Amino acid sequence: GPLGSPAATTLPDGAAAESLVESSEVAVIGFFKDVESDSAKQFLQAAEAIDDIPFGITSNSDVFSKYQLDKDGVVLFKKFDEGRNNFEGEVTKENLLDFIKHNQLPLVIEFTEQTAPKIFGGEIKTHILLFLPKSVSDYDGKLSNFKTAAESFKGKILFIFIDSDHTDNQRILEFFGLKKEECPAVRLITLEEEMTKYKPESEELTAERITEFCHRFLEGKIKPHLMS
């Protein structure tokens, strides 16, 4: 019965490393000298618990040199964005699963049929939504600005963008109770103790608008919900 293989892929060389990657858009590798330690085992049980993103491991000296390292440590590989995210230090199955799932996705994500489910999850997090009309033409510019702002608040909030989709996004508009007056705007969403949405108001500048919203929130401001 040709079937059944470890969720974690260990490559004693770079060549084997790239192989596992090509077999998966995004993958995370961990450097462990003595996998015999209870830590290493915990990391394994975790990688298996979640098959969302394949995990790999390495302990060869040749590998560390390639990445300019001389000590253990795990790092996540991604197509875009950072590409590599070295874990702080604490090796935990639960804490690792979160970092992986939270790092498995880009700093920003466009609203789409696939994004709908990807959002429902996250597990209590703060993310802002930006409504963009066409999006085309300003992709490079907007992206460059988004990344900058995202990196500044990386690990605290994720900036998402929504495509006007005046056609397929019809249902979405209904939920927000918006019609004809369906013009560009910025909306922020929070997650922790409840599911509350934030609607825009004043008109400033692209980044200044989004960055201004976050600041207000972290400034210990009041809850949005509606207008008083």
UniProtKB/Swiss-Prot annotation:
The modification N6-succinyllysine is found at K93, K142. Reduces and may activate fusogenic properties of HIV-1 gp120 surface protein, thereby enabling HIV-1 entry into the cell. The gene is P4HB. The modification N6-acetyllysine is found at K71. It is linked to Cole-Carpenter syndrome 1: A form of Cole-Carpenter syndrome, a disorder characterized by features of osteogenesis imperfecta such as bone deformities and severe bone fragility with frequent fractures, in association with craniosynostosis, ocular proptosis, hydrocephalus, growth failure and distinctive facial features. Craniofacial findings include marked frontal bossing, midface hypoplasia, and micrognathia. Despite the craniosynostosis and hydrocephalus, intellectual development is normal. CLCRP1 inheritance is autosomal dominant. Heterodimer; heterodimerizes with the protein microsomal triglyceride transfer MTTP. Homodimer. Monomers and homotetramers may also occur. Interacts with P4HA2, forming a heterotetramer consisting of 2 alpha subunits (P4HA2) and 2 beta (P4HB), where P4HB plays the role of a structural subunit; this tetramer catalyzes the formation of 4-hydroxyproline in collagen. Also constitutes the structural subunit of the microsomal triacylglycerol transfer protein MTTP in mammalian cells. Stabilizes both enzymes and retain them in the ER without contributing to the catalytic activity. Binds UBQLN1. The modification Phosphoserine is found at S202, S228. This multifunctional protein catalyzes the formation, breakage and rearrangement of disulfide bonds. At the cell surface, seems to act as a reductase that cleaves disulfide bonds of proteins attached to the cell. May therefore cause structural modifications of exofacial proteins. Inside the cell, seems to form/rearrange disulfide bonds of nascent proteins. At high concentrations and following phosphorylation by FAM20C, functions as a chaperone that inhibits aggregation of misfolded proteins. At low concentrations, facilitates aggregation (anti-chaperone activity). This is Protein disulfide-isomerase. It comes from Homo sapiens (Human). It comes from the Eukaryota. It is found in: Endoplasmic reticulum; Endoplasmic reticulum lumen; Melanosome; Cell membrane. Phosphorylation of Ser-228 by FAM20C is induced by endoplasmic reticulum stress and results in a functional switch from oxidoreductase to molecular chaperone. It also promotes interaction with ERN1. Transmembrane segments: none annotated. Belongs to the protein disulfide isomerase family. Changing S228A: Abolishes phosphorylation at this site but protein is still phosphorylated at other sites. No changes in chaperone or enzyme activity.
